[PDB]
Amino acid sequence: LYGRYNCKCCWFADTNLITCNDHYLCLRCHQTMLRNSELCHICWKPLPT
């Protein structure tokens, strides 16, 4: 089972979240961290597509 259905970067966004193979990412934080680099910076894995 995954976590508690929260972005894990803002704690406050629970709506159509995306999984990062270990947690639930938000729709905007994913784009920001992807525009930054190729790493995840919150679980240290390759980010999804």
């Binding site: 976590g3 803002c10 704690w11 406050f12 240290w44």
Partner: protein, 1603 residues
């Protein structure tokens, strides 16, 4: 008559030394009658005891039993109508009196109670005997056994046995017989059925007002119906109207309120940190003045140190002429230096140690040259031979060790000194007592001036700490508004660059707060930098920490590297905040930062109390708090504010802000003022009792209350239990409602809660109190004075030198020993010592034998100088006196002229107040029923025989009030007598057992604490409702009557008997506790009597003389002292909280589980089936908790994002590390008695710090700071020393021995010799494991030494003479070779290998840090290193030869070769032997992987993870007790017999070969006994205490691979 007749025969072995002995024995032996026999025998035994005790003190036994009035009237002495007291032994001589009262008590309780009842009765007589008479010294001789020096110490117990047997055979009341037998046994818990428990017609109303509504049998359905109806009433009556206590978050309004309360807007202060605070301005001045811009000095420093050393011997019995002589020596040395080498007075003085027309002298003093020559011009013409006697006194009766060949006997030529004075003209300091801004805008400075600011702060703080070091018994030559022209002020120096130095001028000594003036000196041009006012003992943290703070700030800033542009604004702000915190330490900054922590906690969550923002505001004074509050609030707003893109990485933001709020740990917690803190503690203690209306005044202290006292007590008891379940008015006043308590008990009994009454392991298995904190109580002072006076009187069998004062140093803690024992005292300790000396001297003077004091306090010892000007005392003491003074100093000081000698010695010196006091003292300006006549010799009348509902016939449970130092606000503290301590111990053990039977409470059970931690972690990870409830006023609100009711309603069923234990003793002790008496501090009474508004001061003045007398004892209903009933309070809280969880589960269909720690709790609620529909439940829970005595604090929070319990914050995914807490803990608590213990302490702290993922770049800096602290004290660097630098993340799987081994391996570069030693150690280990298995024979090789042991091991494995000469060459210096460094450190008043001490500690069961370190540095400079005598450390280190044979230069001043220590070879030991011992012991400890060769290997700084140690033990891991004792007895019989196991009764198991001959413990226990820094046996008997290490992935990739 079997024993009756044998008594007269057995007592025949008595020696009639005195006449009364025989006169009583002839009457006892010649009278056989059972009624006058027991009294005669008891009185004869008592007379023997008291006669021995009297003759022991050169006494005169009182054979007439006459009072003191008539014993004074025998001589010519007027009776001032003293109280009638019968003394046991008297001794009158001249005009002094010695009264001694002796007794005997066998148990400690009655011994203390009798001593504290006889000493007070003796002290109450001196106030009436001194007003119109003579002085007296009281002696109290108590003996805990009937032994003496007249019989062979074997007949006394036989006589005792015969007497008790005759008494129990036939008698002739009921309790006079139970006490006599109890007072003749030797030694003898609960079950006090021997007591009587007689009623007193007052306990009827107690039981009628305590147990009328308590039933405890209510059914289960009725509770459900009542709870349902109560909820239905609550929902529509007090919640839908808006009278709740909790509300939603609404972050925007939170930020608005923060900006309103923190960022001041109506203030006139500017936005510049350097303009408001003075110390920051001085730091800025010095920094931006320094940044942007030779045998003479050594000779001067050497002779100055020699003068400073000769000043410490006080070989002149005076202070003025001593300073004149030292000044003469110094000026003659200056004029002898200025004879030639013209480039010395301007080159090596201006750039060295000199200032404008001022020279440096002894005692860190600075003296004007013109004043110096003017004072040297005195003492000549009127005393022409002054230079002659001083020159011929430094040879005979003198150390005769001096280099003063010509600088001493020279006559000071004044013309050359005037030439020097006219060379450099006056530019003296100004000593400034009591708008344009140009300050470079800190935010836009380079990265080099800020480090310079930190370095300058470090330097000035070190100078302040050193200013605290100046001698106390020091008086300036001449004495002294807004500006004072300094001429004779003290000065300290600190170096900053090649040419410029900095001076710090002050005028006072001690540890008080002062005003300092900071100046600079570039090339002799003395400039001005500023002035400020501070307390020196609050600046110890930055003393050497200028690289630790920079590193922690740097990495705390790098935490925010997710946005390039956020850290660039928060870096300088954070650094400036740290600087402003360090330059202004105060309690208000601590309080504000704690409030910030709670604000962040409430911001992250969703529901919070409605009274929060009223707990965050602090009234800022001094205009220096305003800037720090603005900085902190600005940082909070910059990190938290925003509309949408303000939470991109919230874990990092929460961590940053929590560590920012935890910066309150940098400021010390050391009570800025003692009297103010005691006053505040008394306010906080007595305010709620006066608000409630039950605080009585001074009781009888015997268990007897008047009618009004019991009336008010019962009224308070009724008011406590008179709260209803509907009225919403009483939700903040103490008290409990009986209906809900009955529900709780009735539901607890019928196995419904999560705890039950199914317990196992049946639980029934001389200080004064009104002054807590004083360094010397009245009792100790009077005892010391009496002891000294009695000793001096017994010696006079007159004349006396100052050696008597030496006696006062012998019992409180040969000029060298006197100087070593006097210098270890603190300022107020010096004052108390002066008081004691004065009292003893006046007493001895009496033994040898202005009007405003008679009406006022007649004691001239406390005549204040603030009631009189200075000129009047200065002129009146120098008037005409013919027979008061005498010519000369009279060093021999014969008895009979001691007062004249003291007056003369005080008048010759500068101070005149002592002369005036001595003139006042010298001018006489101070002028057969066996129940009543049998309880006076040795009958322990005060023993517990019958008790009532309020006392125990032996007191009323007296306590004492004090405080405890904390970060935010101080805590309360109660210190009681011995009897009350025993009773509290009984009840606490009972309740601790009962709670140990329970499950959910976690206060003294670490497994339940770990279970709570796991539950909380899983809740925060899953998304359950976590409610962190901290309760307010838990101590001063609870009452023992609540526990009484709870226990009366309980049953506590036995495990397998089901007997319903009767709790009579527990309830009796609780009733005794309910009527306890608390004594108020005497300082508060004095401050409120001598004489802003205060409630407690109002109560004091209202109760001072209106109702009765000045309050000294306060009894009330509700105290429940903090730290007294801790366990019973925990039990009550557990029961009530389980009831509340049951009610919540019943009403709101949720699943709660709660953990409690007796003051705060955490409740984890799992809800069915976002979190806006749970406000009603929380408000209802708070209402019900208020219906019990469990008020909730506004700091409590409810949410689903963060959880707190015992200061341990758990968040989504991980846990916040709290870096700054551990760093500030490491920089503090430098408690040093030896460098080894300091190294070990900082090692443990750094280990527990790096366990919480701090860094490996900040621990090396703490290590270097501790190394520099050791080096600065004068001890020098050692191979082991403090913890190691350049460490790695291998604090896991590594003990202290392993990092010591790493340090020693790092000393050697190519690790060749260490490799050889390690290979030999591996050979020895493999040979002791199997093959040629060894035995205890190696023990006989270890106890010899270092050289022989190492060469024996080497020739055991295999070697030759080449290895003998090679390995044994590397030597280091061990000052602790013939013992340990002798030193008297800053301890409290009134006062062999270390493995033995550790085992003794295992078998059995207010001071500043800056002052302690100053005392340590001061003691490490005297004669400390022992030999054969004692000597200095620089004397030892000056005997080493600078050979430099390219083997002693690989690590200078640490490792030498053999021939470099030929001069001093007693202190020289091989380091390879210590390396071998450490390698072998680490092999014993944590595996055999410590033999391989170290190889080096071939990540965003935020990738953390948890790792476990990888140790493998080969020492039979269990390794319990009773194993080291057996091996110690085997190998060291004499050392096992003495110093070990006198307090041991289970030798049988430890002797019957209980798992004897351990695998490796046989040899790895002798290496620990001789090495004074190995210490593994004290480590094997201890847990890891960490068990897991959080570390970043960047460090785990750079470690060393040793396998």
């Amino acid at each position: 008559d079997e024993y009756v007749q044998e008594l007269k025969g057995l007592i025949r072995k008595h020696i009639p030394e005195r006449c009364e002995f025989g006169h009583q024995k002839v009457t006892f032996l010649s009278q056989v009658h059972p009624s006058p026999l027991l009294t005669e025998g008891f009185k004869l035994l008592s007379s023997l005891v008291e006669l021995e005790s009297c003759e022991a003190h050169a006494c005169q036994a009182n054979t007439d039993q006459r009072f003191v009035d008539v014993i004074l009237s025998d001589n010519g002495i007027l009776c001032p109508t003293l109280p009638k007291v019968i003394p046991d032994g008297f001794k009158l001589t001249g005009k002094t009196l010695i009264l001694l009262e002796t007794f005997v008590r066998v148990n400690p309780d009655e011994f203390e109670k009798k001593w504290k009842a006889d000493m007070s009765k003796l002290l109450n007589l001196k106030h009436d005997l001194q007003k119109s008479g003579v002085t007296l010294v009281p002696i109290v001789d108590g003996r805990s056994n009937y032994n003496n020096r007249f019989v062979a110490d074997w007949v006394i117990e036989r006589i005792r046995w015969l007497l008790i047997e005759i008494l129990k055979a036939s008698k002739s009341e009921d309790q006079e017989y139970q006490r006599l037998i109890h007072s003749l046994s030797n030694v003898k818990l609960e079950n006090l059925e021997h007591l009587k428990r007689n009623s007193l017609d007052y306990d009827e109303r107690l039981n009628e007002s305590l147990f009328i509504g308590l039933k405890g049998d209510i059914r289960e359905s009725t509770v459900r119906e009542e709870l349902i109806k109560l909820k239905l009433w609550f929902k529509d009556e007090v919640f839908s109207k808006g009278l709740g206590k909790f509300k939603l978050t609404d972050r925007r309004e939170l930020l608005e309120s923060l900006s309103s309360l923190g960022a001041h807007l109506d203030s006139d202060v500017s936005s510049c940190p350097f303009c408001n605070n003075k110390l920051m301005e001085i730091v800025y001045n010095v920094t931006f003045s320094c940044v942007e811009r030779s045998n003479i000095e050594k000779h001067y420093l050497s002779v100055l140190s020699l003068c400073n050393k000769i000043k410490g011997l006080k070989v002149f019995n005076t202070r003025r002429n001593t300073l004149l002589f030292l000044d003469l020596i110094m000026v003659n040395l200056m004029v002898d230096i200025s004879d030639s080498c013209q480039d010395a007075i301007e080159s090596l003085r201006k750039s060295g140690l000199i200032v404008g027309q001022m020279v440096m002298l002894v005692n860190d003093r600075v003296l004007d040259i013109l004043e110096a020559v003017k004072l040297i011009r005195k003492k000549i013409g009127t005393n022409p031979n002054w230079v002659k006697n001083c020159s011929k006194i430094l040879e005979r009766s003198h150390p005769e060790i001096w280099h003063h060949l010509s600088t001493l006997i020279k006559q000071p030529d004044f013309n050359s000194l005037i030439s020097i004075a006219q060379h450099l003209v006056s530019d003296r300091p100004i000593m400034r007592y009591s708008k344009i801004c140009r300050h470079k805008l800190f935010q836009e400075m380079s990265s080099f001036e800020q480090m310079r600011l930190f370095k300058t702060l470090s330097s000035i703080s070190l100078s302040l700490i050193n200013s605290m070091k100046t001698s106390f018994s020091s008086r300036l030559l001449v004495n002294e508004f807004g500006n004072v022209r300094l001429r004779e002020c003290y000065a300290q120096r600190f170096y900053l660059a090649e040419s410029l130095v900095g001076f710090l001028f002050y005028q006072k000594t001690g540890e008080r707060s002062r005003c300092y003036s900071v100046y600079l000196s570039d090339n002799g041009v003395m400039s001005e930098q500023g002035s400020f006012y501070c307390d020196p003992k609050r600046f110890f943290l930055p003393v050497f920490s200028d690289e630790v703070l920079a590193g922690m700030c740097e990495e705390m800033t790098s935490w925010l590297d997710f946005d390039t542009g956020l850290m660039n604004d928060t870096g300088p702000i954070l650094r400036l905040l740290v600087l402003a915190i360090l330059c202004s330490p105060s309690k208000r900054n601590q309080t504000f930062l704690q409030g910030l922590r709670y604000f962040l906690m409430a911001f992250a969550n969703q529901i919070h109390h409605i009274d929060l923002t009223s707990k965050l505001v602090v009234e800022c004074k001094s205009s220096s708090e305003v800037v720090v509050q603005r900085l902190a609030v600005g940082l909070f707003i910059r990190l938290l504010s925003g509309e949408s893109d303000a939470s991109l990485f919230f874990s990092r933001r929460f961590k940053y802000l929590l560590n920012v709020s935890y910066l309150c740990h940098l400021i010390t917690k050391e009570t800025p003022d003692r009297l103010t803190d005691q006053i505040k503690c008394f306010e906080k203690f007595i305010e709620p009792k006066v608000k409630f209306g039950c605080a009585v005044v001074n009781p009888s202290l015997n268990g007897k209350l008047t009618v009004d006292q019991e009336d008010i007590m019962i009224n308070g008891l009724k008011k406590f239990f008179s709260k209803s379940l509907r009225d919403t008015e009483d939700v903040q006043t103490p008290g409990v409602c009986k209906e809900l308590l009955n529900y709780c008990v009735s539901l607890f009994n019928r196995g419904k809660l999560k705890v039950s009454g199914e317990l196992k392991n049946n639980p029934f298995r001389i200080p004064k109190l009104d002054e807590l904190g004083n360094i010397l109580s009245t009792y100790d002072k009077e005892k010391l004075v009496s002891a000294c006076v009695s000793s001096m009187a017994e010696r006079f069998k007159n004349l006396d030198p100052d050696s008597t004062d030496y006696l006062i140093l012998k019992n409180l803690t040969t000029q060298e020993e006197l100087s070593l024992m006097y210098e270890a005292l603190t300022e107020e300790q010096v004052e108390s010592f002066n008081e004691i000396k004065h009292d003893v001297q006046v007493a001895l003077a009496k033994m040898a034998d202005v009007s405003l004091h008679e009406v006022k306090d007649f004691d001239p010892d406390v005549l204040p100088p603030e009631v009189y000007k200075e000129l009047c005392d200065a002129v009146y003491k120098s008037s005409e006196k013919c027979n008061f003074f005498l010519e000369g100093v009279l060093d021999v000081c014969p008895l009979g002229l001691l007062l004249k000698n003291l007056t003369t010695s005080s008048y010759v010196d500068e101070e005149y107040f002592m002369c005036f006091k001595y003139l006042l003292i010298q001018g006489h300006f101070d002028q057969f029923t066996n129940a009543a006549l049998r309880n006076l010799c040795f009958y322990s009348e005060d023993s517990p025989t019958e008790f009532t509902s309020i006392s125990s016939n032996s007191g009323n449970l007296k306590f004492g009030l004090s405080y405890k130092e904390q970060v935010g606000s101080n805590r309360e503290l109660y210190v009681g007598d011995l009897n009350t301590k025993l009773m509290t111990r009984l009840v606490e053990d009972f309740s601790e057992a009962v709670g140990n039977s329970m499950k959910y409470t976690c206060l003294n059970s670490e497994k339940e604490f770990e279970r709570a931690i796991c539950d909380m972690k899983m809740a925060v990870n899953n998304g359950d409702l976590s409610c962190s409830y901290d309760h307010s006023k838990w101590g001063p609100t609870m009452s023992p009557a609540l526990f009484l009711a709870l226990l009366q309603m309980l049953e506590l069923r036995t495990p397998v008997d089901r007997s319903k234990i009767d709790l009579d003793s527990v309830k009796s002790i609780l009733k005794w506790h309910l009527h306890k008496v608390v004594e108020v501090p005497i300082n508060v009474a004095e401050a409120y009597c001598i004489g802003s508004t205060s409630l407690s001061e109002e109560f004091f003045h209202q109760t001072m003389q209106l109702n009765g007398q000045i309050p000294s004892h306060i009894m009330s209903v509700l105290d429940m002292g903090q730290g007294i009933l801790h366990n019973t309070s925990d039990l009550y809280g557990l029961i009530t909280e389980q009831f509340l969880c049951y009610a919540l589960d019943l009403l709101y269909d949720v699943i709660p589980v709660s953990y409690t720690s007796s003051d705060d709790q955490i409740t984890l609620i799992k809800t069915p089936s976002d979190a806006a529909e749970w406000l009603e439940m929380i408000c209802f829970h708070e209402f019900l908790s208020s219906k019990l005595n469990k008020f909730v604090s506004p700091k409590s929070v409810i949410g689903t994002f963060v959880a707190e319990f015992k200061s341990r914050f758990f968040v989504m995914g991980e846990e916040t590390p709290l870096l700054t807490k551990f760093v500030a803990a490491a920089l503090h608590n430098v408690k040093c008695k030896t460098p080894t213990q300091l190294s070990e302490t900082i090692d443990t702290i750094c280990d527990q710090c790096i366990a919480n993922g701090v860094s490996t770049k900040i621990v090396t800096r703490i290590s270097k700071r501790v190394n520099q602290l050791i080096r600065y004290s004068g001890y020098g660097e050692t191979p082991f020393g403090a913890i190691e630098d350049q460490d790695v993340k291998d604090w896991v799987d590594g003990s202290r021995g392993y990092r010591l081994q790493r340090k020693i391996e790092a000393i050697f570069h190519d690790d060749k010799e260490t490799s050889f030693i390690r290979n030999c150690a591996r050979k020895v280990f493999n040979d002791i494991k199997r093959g040629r298995i060894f035995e205890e024979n190696l023990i006989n090789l270890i106890g010899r030494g270092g050289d022989e042991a190492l060469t024996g091991f080497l020739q055991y494995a295999g070697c030759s003479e080449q290895e003998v000469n090679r390995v044994l060459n590397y030597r280091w210096v061990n000052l602790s070779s013939f013992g340990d460094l002798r030193l008297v450190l800053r301890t409290k008043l009134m006062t062999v290998p270390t493995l033995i001490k550790t085992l003794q500690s295992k078998l059995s069961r207010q001071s500043s840090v800056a002052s302690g370190f100053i005392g340590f540095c001061k003691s490490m400079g005297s004669k400390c290193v022992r030999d054969g005598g004692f000597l200095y450390i620089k004397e030892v280190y000056s005997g080493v030869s600078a050979c430099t044979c390219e083997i002693c230069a690989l690590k200078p001043k640490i490792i030498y070769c053999n021939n470099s220590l030929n001069k001093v070879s007693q202190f020289s030991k091989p380091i390879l032997w210590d390396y071998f011992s450490l390698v072998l012991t680490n092999a014993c400890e944590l595996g055999e992987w410590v033999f391989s060769t170290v190889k080096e290997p071939q990540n965003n700084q935020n990738f953390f993870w948890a790792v476990k140690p990888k140790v493998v033990r080969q020492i039979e891991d269990q390794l319990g007790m009773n194993h080291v004792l057996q091996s110690i007895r085997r190998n060291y019989p004499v050392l096992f017999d003495e110093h070990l196991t006198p307090f041991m009764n289970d030798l049988q198991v430890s002797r019957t070969m209980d798992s004897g001959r351990l695998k490796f413990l046989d040899v790895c226990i002798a290496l620990d006994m001789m090495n004074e820094n190995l210490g593994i046996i004290s480590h094997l008997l201890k847990t890891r205490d960490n068990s897991v290490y959080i570390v970043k992935q960047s460090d785990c990739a750079l470690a060393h691979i040793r396998q």
